[PDB]
Design a protein around this ligand. Structure first.
Ligand code: A1CS1
Length: 113
């Protein structure tokens, strides 16, 4: 399928044990997609002070359209040293590996893949 319905655990930035997916734009998009498939991907909501606490390159989920079955349609956009790879809508948050941190909420998304 071109899209998959996912329910992403929303993590507090200070709970995150692995603060990024790797070392290059291509690796972090690859790893983020693999973790989304395997159900081991969390979401951190972006506010003041969050991004400097996470590791670049960043993988964002961004709104791709204006929301089937309660799932907002999203796509992946990576960022490194102020350059974004991808063009999309409003940021829903930054993806990180999930290694068993307790979430504060779940975010339902329809991931374009
Ligand atoms: O996340 C998923 N859940 C169910 C099966 N498919 C996936 C998936 C496949 C490929 C991707 O690139 C990203 C996600």
């Amino acid at each position: 399928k071109t899209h998959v319905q996912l329910s992403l655990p929303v993590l507090q930035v200070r709970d995150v044990l692995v603060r990024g997916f790797g070392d290059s734009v291509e690796e972090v998009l690859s790893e983020a997609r693999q973790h989304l498939k395997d159900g081991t991907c969390g979401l951190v909501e972006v506010e003041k002070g969050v991004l400097p606490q996470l590791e670049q390159p960043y993988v964002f989920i961004k709104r791709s359209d204006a929301a089937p079955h309660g799932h907002v349609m999203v796509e992946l956009v990576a960022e490194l040293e102020g350059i974004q790879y991808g063009r999309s809508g409003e940021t829903l948050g930054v993806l990180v590996p999930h290694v068993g941190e307790i979430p504060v909420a779940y975010r339902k998304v329809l991931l374009r893949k």
